[PDB]
Design a protein around this nucleic acid. Structure first.
Ligand SMILES: [Zn+2]
Lengths: 82, 96, 214, 26, 662, 49, 87, 159, 47, 116
RNA sequence: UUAUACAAUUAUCAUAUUAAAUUGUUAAGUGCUGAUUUAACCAAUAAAAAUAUAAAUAAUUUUUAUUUGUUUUUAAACACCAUUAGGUA
C-alpha cells in the first residue's frame, strides 16, 4: 500500500521469530516431513511462514543458529511464539 | 510497440520502412553488377554494398571492371543517373 | 527526491555529511571509496574558493570542477573534463547557469522571478525538443502543457514586478507574443487583465519612473 | 492550385447530402 | 566588382531583349512602354497565387456562411436549420478567429493530421506542415505519402525537407547530426522511389543546402548537394534551372560556414545570370564582407586580395546594389550594413545609416545601437552623442542591456575621460537594477583610473561596483586586473587606506601580488601627503617587494624616489634604493631591456562576440496556444461551481447539522 | 473585481505612497494653473442657449 | 535606485529559499535552527523555553500570563514543535 | 569511464582486425574523443554462434574491451560506425558506468546520495570485477609486496 | 589513467593483438571473464 | 612548508593561531600567507578564518600606530583619526559591525581575541 | 409539506490517478521482456506565482485499451471460413 512489496530476508534467527507467529525452516530434499507439518498447521487455521533453506543467501548463518536453538541437526523445525 | 529487423545482421531499421524502402533498394540486391565493381581496399570497412543503399549521395570508391582504374563516384550517380569509369570513357572517345 | 536532485545540482557538498560518508558509501564501500591510496601531489587548501560558492559559477568543465583544480594533470584529463565531454544534463545546467549569472540577486538565489521565468522557458524548450523526436510520448505532452502554464504565470508576474528584465527577456529571445490571450470571448469581458487584480499585481508599477502622474 | 475543383465538388456534395437530410427516411 | 558586373549584365540583358523583340514580331517596339533590365523568379509564383485566388472555384469554395434568411425559416426544417459547411484557407482567411472554444462548434480537434489524410492526392504539403496538429516525424510523413501512392512534385519534397529543417532549427546545437541523417535518408528515399512519381527539383536541393547550413556542415552541403544540383542543371537544362532560392541557400551556407569567397562568387553568379537577387542575399553578402574585413583587421593587428582599400570599394557597392533593382531596405540590411561599416572602420557611414533608417521607416533594432556605439569607439569628442544615444532608447521602445553598457564603458575607457562613465553610471545604469559583468567593471575602472584629474566619487562608484560584482557570481576571472586598475585609481587619487584595505580582498581570492600593485601603492603614498601615509608606509611597501617574492621594476625606482620626497630620510628605504640601483645596473650589464610597468589592455571586441548570456529559445507562441504536439491539460475534478446546476437551499450548518450513525 | 484583496492593496497603497514621499526630492512649489472647463456634465444635454 | 517589489507573504516575510527552485518549501525548522545558532551565551542572560514576544508592548496585560512570556528580540519567531497536519 | 564497449569480432587474419581497430580508433580520434583503454581478450568459443554478413554461423569469436571518453553526439556517430561494421558481430554499449545500477530504479532516498566522480575516475575493471579480481589484490598494491613475497616458495623447492 | 594517444595507437593495437601467441616464455593472463582463451599463432590462425 | 605540502599533513587551528600570533607587522604575515599558498599546505576552514582574522587585526593596530604618530606631534586627533575609532577597516572578512560571522564555522561560537 | 433522490439496475450531462507508471524512429532494451518471475539497463518525466477564503484564481487539449480502414510477387510463417488447396486476415 504505502510501500512497495519486498521479500523479507535476514541473517538472524530471532528476526524471523519476532516477525512471524509460526516459522518453519525446511530443505528441498525432505519433501515428506515438511508436508506433514503443513497438514497439521493448516488444520488448525494458523498462518505459517515456510522458509526453504535451499537457495538462501544466509544458509550458514541460519544453519548455525538452528543448531543452537535445537540441539538436533534435524530439518524441518517448527517455531511458534519465539 | 515497433518491430525491427537487421539488414545483413548489422543495420537496425524499423520493419515497416524496411519492406518499403530499405530492403529492395540496397546496392548488393538491386544492382549486383554495379555492386560487383565495389572497391574493397579504398572504401571504409564499415561501408559495403550489403548495407549502402542506391541513393547514397556521398562519393565512394569504385574499382573498374573492364579496365583497371579506381575512381570516386556517388552511388546515386552510378545507378540512377548513370555513371562509368572516367578512364574507360576517355578510351572510348579515343577508339571511336 | 526531486528537490534533492536540484540541491545536488546547485550546491556542492550537500550530499557529504559531517561524518564524510555518503548513504551509498555506507552500504557499498568497495564501489564508492578509493581503491588505491597515493602518497603524492597533495593539493592542500583551496585559496581560490571565494570565486565558486555554488556550482552555477563554474560550468566550464565537467562535474562543476574549477580550472584552478586542474593544474598538475596532463592534457588528456583536462580534455576528458572539457565542454565537449559534458552530458545532456550538464549542458542543460550550463544553459541554466548562463541565465543565473545574469539575473540573480545574490549568489545563492534561485527563486527570483526573472530566474524562474527563464528556468520554466528552458524546461519548455527541453520538453518540446523531446516531443519533436518522439511525438508518441503521452506524459511529456501533459508535462509540457503544465510547464507552459507555469511559464505564463512566471512571465506574467515578472512583467509586473520588474518590467525591464521582462522586456529584456522578451527582446533577446525573439518571443514577443508569448503573453497573448487565448480566446477572444473571454478577453472581451476583461478576464485576461483581471489576472493582474486577482494575483496582487495591480499597483506594482512605480508611476514616477515611467510616466508623469500629474 | 490544381486540386481545388475536386475539393469543391466534395464540399458541394456534402452540402447536397445535408439538403438530402430534409427528406428524412428513405 | 559586383556593381560593374551588374551594369554589364543589365546592358547585356537589355541588348538581348532588344534583339529578341525585334526578331520576334516587333511588338515591344510598337508598345515601347518599359523593359526590365533584370529577371525576377518570384513574380511567377506570386502571379500564380494571385490568379489562383481570383479563380471562381476558389471563391465558390471559400464562400461565407449562409445566413438564416438565406437558409430559410426560423427552424424546424431538417438540413436547413443551420448553415452549411464553411471552408477556410489558413493563409488568407475570410473570417477572423478561425478556431474557437465553444461547446458545440468546437473545431480545434478537427484541425489535426488525419482528417487531411482523406485527400492526399489534392493535398498541399507546405500548408500541411504550417497548419496542422499532431504531425508525425517527417520520415513517417514521407512514409505515409509514399504509402498512399501520391505523385509528389518538387513542392511536396521541398515541404517535407522544410519540416525536417524546422525540426533541425528547433533542436539544440549538440543534437543536429541525427536529424540531418534523417534528412539525408528522406532525400535518398525521394530519389530512389520512382513509383509513386517523385521528382527532386531545385527547391529540394535548396532545402538540403539549408539543412546543411542549419546543422553546420560545409563539406556536406557545398561539395555534395550543391555540386549535385549543378550537375543536374548542366546535364539537362530548361527543366532544372537554379532560381534565387537555391543561391539564397548557398549564401546561407557560406555565411554559416564562414566561407567568404564562395558567397561572393555565387552572388556574382546570381548577377551574371541576369536575375535579381533577394534582399537577404545582399544582407548575407554584407555579412561576408564584414567577416572578411574583421579578418583583415585581425591580420594587420597581428602582423585572394591583400589590398584592404579595395575591399571597401567592393563592399559599399553591395549597399549600392539595393537601390539598383528595387530591393527595399529591411532591418537586417541595416544591421549587416552597420556591421560591414564597423568592420571597415568607417563611423560616418554608420552615423549616416542610423539616420537613413529613421528616414523612410525602419525599426532601429538594438544590435544597431551596439554597432552605433562600436563605430565611434576610437573617435574622440563624441561623448554627448553616447549620452544622447542612451536616452534615445526610451522613445524608441528599447531598454539597454549589458552589451550596450559594456560598449559605452569601452568608449569611456578608450577615450579615458572618466566623467562620461560616471555620468552614464549615475543616471543610466543605477536605474536598470541589473548585474554588472566583470568586463563592465573592468572598463569602468579603466575609464576612471586613466582619466585626467579623477575624483573621489569615482572611487565610491568603483568600490560599490566591486562590491556589487562580488555580491553576485561570474565565470570569467578578471579579479586581478580590476584590483590593479582600482589600485591605479587609488594611486591617482592618493588614498592609501582604501588601497591598503583592498589588499585583503586580493588575499581572500587567492590572487598573487604583482609589482604593478605595489608600484600603485607607492604612487598612492607619494600623493597622500594631505590625506594619510607616513615614513613607515613606504617601509612596509619596501618590505612587500623585499620578502614576498616580487622583483622590483624600473618604475619602482621612480615611485620610491618620489615617495622619498617630503617624507624623511628612512635609511632602510635608502638601502632599498641602493639595492634597486645595483640590480637595475646589473641586469642592464647583462644586456636586458629596461622593463617598465605594462598597461592593462582595453578590450575592443566587436559586439557579436562579447559573451552573450543567452543560447536560444526556439519557442513559438502559436504552437503553444493552438496546442500542437498534442499538449493535454488535465481538467479539474468536478470543479465547475455553477449556479444553474444547484437545486438545494443552503442553510447555515446544513439541513441536518449533527447526525449520528446508530 | 475581487474585493477581498482590497485592503492588502491599501497596505501597498500606503507603502507606495510613503516611499514616494521619501525617495524623490521636491524642488519647490509649482505654480497653480488655471483650470479649464469639462464637457462631461451630468444629467441630460443642455442647450446652446 | 530601483528596488524590487516584495510580492506575496513569503517575500514580505523575507524567506531565504534555501532549497533550489522551490518557493513553497516549508522553512520553519531551518530558520528556527539558524536562529538558535544566532544566539550566544554572554558572560561578563540566555533565553528560556517559555514563549516569547518580539516587542515589549506585545506582552499580555494579565500579570499571571506575563510570567509565562518573555521578551526575545528576533528569537520570538518560528516557535513550535508540531507542523501543520495533512491527509 | 565514460563509455565502454565489448566488441565481438570475427576471427579473421591479423591485418584485417588491426585495420578494423585502427578505423575504429581513428573514428574516435577524428570526432574529438579519447581512448581510455583497448584490450584484446583472445579467441573464445561463445555459447551462441553469431552469424556474419553472409549468414554463416561462427563457432569462434574475438572479444575486445574498448573504454572511451567521447561526447554524446560523437558517441552516437562512433556507435553507428561500430554496429554497422562487417567484422563486428555484436557490441554492447555500457552506459551505466558513471551512475551505478540500481540507484535510479531503486530507493528514492538513495538517488542523489551518490558521487559520480567515484565511478568516473576509475576504469571499467574497477567497476565491473572479473572473477580473478578481489580486494586482496587491491590491498597488495600498497602493502610493499616486493619485500614480502620473496619467501613464498621456501617450502616447495625442497620437495 | 594511461590514455592512448593518436600516434601510439597502431603500436598499442599490435601489442594487444600479440598478447595471446603460441610461442611465449611468459604465463598468459586470464581474460575479463576469468577464462584462458584459445591461443593462436601469427596471421591470426587458431591453434 | 614545502616539506609539509609534500607530506600532506594538516595544520591545526591552534597551530596557525599560534603561528600568526608571533607576527608583529602586517607585511610579515602576508609572507606567511603566500608561502603556504605556494607550498600547497592543507588546513581546516577554521584555520583559514582565524588566519584572515589575524590579518584583519594586524592592519588595525598598524593604522592605530600611524594615527598616534601624528597625534603625539600635533597634540590633538584629526577627524580621520576619530573616524578610524568608530569605523575601522571596511573591507574585512569578519568585521565588527556584523558579529555573527563566526558562529557556524568556529565550534566555540566566539572569535579568538588576542591581547598584548 | 421532498426545500434530502436507500441500495443495485434502465438510460442521458462524461479527464485518462501518474517515478510501482508512460514513451523511445534520429536514443535504449529488443526475436512484440510477462513462458520463469509480486523485483527489468539507459534517455525524457516526481517540487517550483499570489490567494484559502476567493465566491468559477482552471482548461476547451490527449488516448496506454477494442475494432475498422489505409498498400499489393509487396509478411515467409502460425490461426480462421469454403475441405487439403484457395483466399481471409
Ligand atoms: Zn575503366
Amino acid at each position: 500500500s504505502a510501500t512497495r512489496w519486498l521479500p523479507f530476508v535476514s541473517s538472524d534467527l530471532k528476526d524471523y521469530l519476532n516477525r512471524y507467529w509460526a516459522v518453519m525452516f525446511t530443505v528441498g530434499a525432505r519433501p515428506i516431513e515438511t508436508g506433514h507439518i503443513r497438514h497439521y498447521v493448516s488444520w488448525y487455521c494458523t498462518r505459517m511462514k515456510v522458509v526453504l533453506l535451499d537457495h538462501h543467501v544466509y544458509v550458514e548463518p541460519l544453519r548455525q543458529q538452528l543448531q543452537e536453538a535445537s540441539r538436533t541437526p534435524e530439518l524441518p523445525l517448527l517455531f511458534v511464539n519465539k | 510497440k515497433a518491430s525491427h529487423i537487421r539488414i545483413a545482421n548489422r543495420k537496425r531499421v524499423e520493419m515497416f520502412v524496411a519492406k518499403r524502402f530499405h530492403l529492395p533498394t540496397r546496392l548488393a540486391t538491386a544492382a549486383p553488377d554495379i555492386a560487383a565493381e565495389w572497391h574493397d581496399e579504398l572504401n571504409p570497412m564499415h561501408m559495403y554494398p550489403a548495407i549502402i543503399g542506391i541513393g547514397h549521395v556521398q562519393p565512394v570508391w569504385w574499382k573498374c571492371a573492364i579496365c583497371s582504374h579506381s575512381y570516386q563516384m556517388s552511388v546515386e550517380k552510378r545507378v540512377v543517373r548513370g555513371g562509368g569509369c572516367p578512364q574507360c570513357v576517355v578510351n572510348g572517345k579515343r577508339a571511336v | 527526491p526531486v528537490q534533492k536532485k536540484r540541491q545536488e545540482q546547485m550546491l556542492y557538498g550537500v550530499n557529504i555529511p559531517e561524518t564524510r560518508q555518503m548513504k551509498f558509501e555506507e552500504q557499498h564501500p568497495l564501489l564508492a571509496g578509493a581503491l588505491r591510496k597515493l602518497e603524492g601531489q597533495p593539493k592542500g587548501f583551496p585559496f581560490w574558493y571565494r570565486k565558486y560558492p555554488t556550482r552555477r559559477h563554474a560550468y566550464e568543465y565537467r562535474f562543476s570542477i574549477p580550472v584552478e583544480m586542474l593544474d598538475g594533470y596532463n592534457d588528456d584529463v583536462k580534455k576528458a573534463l572539457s565542454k565537449g565531454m559534458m552530458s545532456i544534463q550538464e549542458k542543460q545546467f550550463a544553459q541554466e547557469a548562463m541565465y543565473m549569472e545574469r539575473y540573480a540577486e545574490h549568489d545563492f538565489d534561485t527563486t527570483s522571478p526573472a530566474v524562474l521565468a527563464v528556468k520554466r522557458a528552458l524546461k519548455c524548450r527541453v520538453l518540446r525538443n523531446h516531443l519533436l523526436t518522439n511525438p508518441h510520448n503521452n506524459i511529456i505532452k501533459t508535462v509540457l502543457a503544465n510547464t507552459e502554464r507555469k511559464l505564463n504565470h512566471a512571465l506574467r508576474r515578472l512583467r509586473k514586478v520588474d518590467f525591464k528584465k521582462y522586456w529584456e527577456i522578451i527582446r533577446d529571445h525573439d518571443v514577443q507574443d508569448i503573453l497573448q490571450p487565448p480566446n477572444l470571448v473571454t478577453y472581451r469581458q476583461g478576464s485576461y487583465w483581471k489576472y493582474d487584480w486577482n494575483a496582487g499585481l495591480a499597483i506594482s508599477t512605480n508611476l514616477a519612473d515611467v510616466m508623469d502622474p500629474r | 492550385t490544381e486540386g481545388t475543383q475536386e475539393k469543391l465538388a466534395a464540399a458541394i456534395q456534402e452540402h447536397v447530402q445535408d439538403a438530402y437530410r430534409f427528406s428524412g427516411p428513405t | 566588382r559586383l556593381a560593374a558586373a551588374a551594369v554589364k549584365a543589365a546592358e547585356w540583358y537589355a541588348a538581348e531583349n532588344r534583339r529578341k523583340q525585334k526578331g520576334g514580331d516587333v511588338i515591344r517596339e510598337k508598345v515601347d512602354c518599359t523593359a526590365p533590365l533584370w529577371f525576377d523568379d518570384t513574380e511567377q509564383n506570386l502571379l500564380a497565387r494571385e490568379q489562383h485566388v481570383r479563380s471562381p472555384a476558389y471563391r465558390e469554395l471559400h464562400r461565407p456562411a449562409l445566413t438564416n434568411a438565406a437558409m430559410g425559416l426560423y427552424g424546424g426544417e431538417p438540413g436547413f436549420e443551420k448553415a452549411h459547411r464553411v471552408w477556410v484557407d489558413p493563409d488568407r482567411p475570410h473570417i477572423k478567429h478561425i478556431y474557437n472554444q465553444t461547446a458545440l462548434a468546437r473545431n480545434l480537434r478537427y484541425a489535426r493530421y488525419g482528417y487531411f489524410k482523406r485527400d492526399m492526392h489534392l493535398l498541399d504539403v507546405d500548408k500541411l506542415v504550417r497548419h496542422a496538429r499532431l504531425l508525425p516525424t517527417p520520415g513517417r510523413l514521407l512514409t505515409d505519402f509514399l504509402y498512399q501512392r501520391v505523385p509528389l512534385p518538387d513542392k511536396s519534397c521541398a515541404a517535407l525537407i522544410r519540416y525536417q529543417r524546422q525540426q533541425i532549427e528547433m533542436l539544440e546545437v549538440w543534437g543536429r547530426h541525427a536529424s540531418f541523417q534523417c534528412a539525408v535518408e528522406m532525400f535518398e528515399r525521394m530519389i530512389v522511389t520512382n513509383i509513386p512519381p517523385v521528382e527532386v527539383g531545385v527547391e529540394t536541393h535548396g532545402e538540403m543546402v539549408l539543412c546543411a547550413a542549419a546543422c553546420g556542415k560545409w563539406e556536406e552541403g557545398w561539395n555534395v548537394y550543391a555540386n549535385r544540383a549543378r550537375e543536374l542543371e548542366k546535364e539537362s537544362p530548361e527543366s532544372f534551372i537554379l532560381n534565387t532560392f537555391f543561391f539564397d541557400a548557398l549564401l546561407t551556407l557560406c555565411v554559416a560556414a564562414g566561407r567568404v569567397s564562395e558567397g561572393i562568387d555565387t552572388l556574382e553568379e546570381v548577377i551574371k545570370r541576369n536575375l535579381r537577387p533577394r534582399g537577404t542575399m545582399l544582407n548575407k553578402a554584407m555579412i561576408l564582407y564584414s567577416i572578411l574585413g574583421e579578418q583583415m583587421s585581425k591580420h594587420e593587428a597581428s602582423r585572394y586580395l591583400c589590398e584592404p582599400e579595395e575591399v571597401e570599394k567592393m563592399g559599399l557597392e553591395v549597399w549600392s546594389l539595393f537601390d539598383f533593382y528595387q530591393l527595399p531596405r529591411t532591418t537586417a540590411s541595416i544591421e549587416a550594413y552597420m556591421r560591414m561599416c564597423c568592420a571597415f572602420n568607417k563611423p560616418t557611414l554608420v552615423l549616416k545609416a542610423q539616420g537613413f533608417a529613421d528616414a523612410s521607416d525602419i525599426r532601429l533594432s538594438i544590435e544597431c545601437f551596439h554597432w552605433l556605439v562600436y563605430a565611434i569607439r576610437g573617435v574622440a569628442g563624441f561623448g554627448d552623442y553616447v549620452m544622447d544615444v542612451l536616452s534615445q532608447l526610451r522613445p524608441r521602445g528599447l531598454t539597454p542591456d549589458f552589451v550596450l553598457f559594456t560598449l559605452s564603458f569601452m568608449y569611456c575607457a578608450l577615450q579615458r575621460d572618466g566623467e562620461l562613465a560616471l555620468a552614464i553610471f549615475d543616471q543610466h545604469f543605477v536605474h536598470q537594477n541589473m548585474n554588472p559583468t566583470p568586463e563592465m567593471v573592468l572598463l569602468f575602472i579603466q575609464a576612471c583610473s586613466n582619466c585626467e584629474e579623477p575624483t573621489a566619487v569615482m572611487l565610491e562608484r568603483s568600490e560599490t561596483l566591486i562590491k556589487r560584482l562580488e555580491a553576485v557570481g561570474s565565470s570569467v576571472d578578471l579579479i586581478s586586473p580590476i584590483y590593479d586598475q582600482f589600485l591605479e585609481l587609488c594611486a591617482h587619487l592618493g588614498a592609501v587606506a582604501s588601497g591598503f584595505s583592498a589588499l585583503k580582498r586580493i588575499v581572500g581570492f587567492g590572487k598573487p601580488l604583482t609589482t604593478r600593485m605595489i608600484n600603485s601603492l607607492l604612487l598612492a603614498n607619494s600623493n597622500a601627503i594631505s590625506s594619510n601615509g607616513s615614513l613607515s608606509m613606504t617601509e612596509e611597501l619596501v618590505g612587500f617587494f623585499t620578502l614576498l617574492k616580487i622583483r622590483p621594476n624600473a618604475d619602482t625606482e621612480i615611485c620610491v624616489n618620489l615617495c622619498r620626497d617630503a617624507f624623511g630620510e628612512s635609511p632602510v628605504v635608502n638601502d632599498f634604493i641602493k639595492v634597486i640601483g645595483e640590480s637595475l645596473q646589473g641586469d642592464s650589464e647583462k644586456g636586458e631591456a629596461p622593463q617598465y610597468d605594462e598597461d592593462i589592455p582595453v578590450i575592443q571586441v566587436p559586439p557579436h562576440e562579447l559573451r552573450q548570456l543567452r543560447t536560444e529559445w526556439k519557442l513559438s507562441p502559436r504552437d503553444i496556444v493552438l496546442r500542437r504536439f498534442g499538449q493535454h491539460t488535465k481538467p479539474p475534478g468536478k470543479a465547475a461551481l455553477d449556479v444553474g446546476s444547484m437545486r438545494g437551499s443552503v442553510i447555515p450548518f446544513g439541513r441536518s447539522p449533527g447526525e449520528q450513525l446508530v | 473585481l475581487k474585493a477581498g484583496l482590497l485592503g492588502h492593496y491599501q497596505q501597498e497603497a500606503f507603502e507606495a505612497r510613503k516611499r514616494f514621499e521619501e525617495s524623490t526630492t521636491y524642488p519647490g512649489p509649482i505654480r497653480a494653473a488655471t483650470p479649464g472647463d469639462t464637457r462631461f456634465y451630468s444629467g441630460s444635454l443642455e442647450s446652446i442657449l | 535606485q530601483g528596488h524590487r517589489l516584495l510580492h506575496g507573504k513569503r517575500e514580505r516575510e523575507g524567506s531565504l529559499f534555501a532549497v533550489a527552485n522551490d518557493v513553497k518549501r516549508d522553512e520553519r525548522l531551518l530558520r528556527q535552527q539558524l536562529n538558535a545558532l544566532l544566539e550566544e551565551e554572554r558572560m561578563p542572560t540566555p533565553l528560556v523555553d517559555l514563549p516569547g514576544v518580539e516587542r515589549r508592548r506585545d506582552l499580555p496585560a494579565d500579570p499571571i500570563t506575563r510570567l509565562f512570556f518573555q521578551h526575545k528580540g528576533d528569537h520570538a519567531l518560528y516557535y513550535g514543535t508540531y507542523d501543520k497536519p495533512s491527509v | 569511464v565514460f563509455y565502454s564497449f565489448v566488441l565481438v569480432m570475427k576471427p579473421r587474419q591479423r591485418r584485417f582486425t588491426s585495420q578494423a581497430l585502427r578505423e575504429i580508433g581513428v573514428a574516435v580520434y577524428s570526432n574529438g574523443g579519447l581512448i581510455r583503454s583497448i584490450t584484446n581478450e583472445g579467441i573464445m568459443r561463445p555459447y551462441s554462434r553469431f552469424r556474419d554478413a553472409d549468414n554463416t554461423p561462427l563457432t569462434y569469436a574475438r572479444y575486445i574491451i574498448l573504454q572511451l571518453d567521447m561526447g554524446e553526439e560523437e558517441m552516437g556517430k562512433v556507435d553507428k560506425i561500430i554496429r554497422e561494421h562487417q567484422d563486428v558481430l555484436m557490441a554492447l554499449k555500457l552506459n551505466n558506468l558513471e551512475r551505478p545500477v540500481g540507484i535510479r530504479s531503486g530507493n528514492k532516498e538513495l538517488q542523489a546520495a551518490y558521487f559520480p566522480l567515484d565511478t568516473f575516475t576509475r576504469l571499467e575493471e574497477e567497476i565491473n570485477w572479473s572473477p580473478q579480481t578481489s580486494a586482496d589484490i587491491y590491498t597488495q598494491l600498497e602493502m610493499n609486496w616486493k619485500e614480502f613475497s620473496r619467501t613464498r616458495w621456501s617450502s616447495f623447492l625442497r620437495n | 589513467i594511461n590514455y592512448v594517444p593518436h600516434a601510439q595507437l597502431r603500436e598499442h593495437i599490435d601489442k594487444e593483438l600479440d598478447k595471446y601467441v603460441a610461442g611465449k616464455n611468459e604465463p598468459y593472463p586470464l581474460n575479463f571473464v576469468g577464462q584462458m582463451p584459445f591461443l593462436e599463432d601469427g596471421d591470426g590462425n587458431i591453434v | 612548508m614545502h616539506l609539509a605540502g609534500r607530506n600532506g599533513r594538516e595544520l591545526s587551528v591552534r597551530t596557525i593561531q599560534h603561528l600568526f600570533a608571533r607576527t608583529d607587522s602586517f607585511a610579515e604575515a602576508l609572507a606567511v600567507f603566500y608561502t603556504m599558498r605556494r607550498c600547497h599546505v592543507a588546513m581546516n576552514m577554521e584555520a583559514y578564518y582565524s588566519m584572515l582574522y589575524s590579518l584583519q587585526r594586524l592592519e588595525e593596530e598598524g593604522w592605530g600606530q600611524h594615527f598616534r604618530n601624528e597625534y603625539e606631534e600635533n597634540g590633538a586627533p584629526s577627524e580621520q583619526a576619530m573616524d578610524f575609532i568608530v569605523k575601522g577597516i571596511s573591507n574585512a572578512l569578519l568585521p565588527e559591525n556584523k558579529p555573527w560571522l563566526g558562529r557556524v564555522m568556529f565550534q566555540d561560537r566566539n572569535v579568538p581575541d588576542r591581547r598584548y
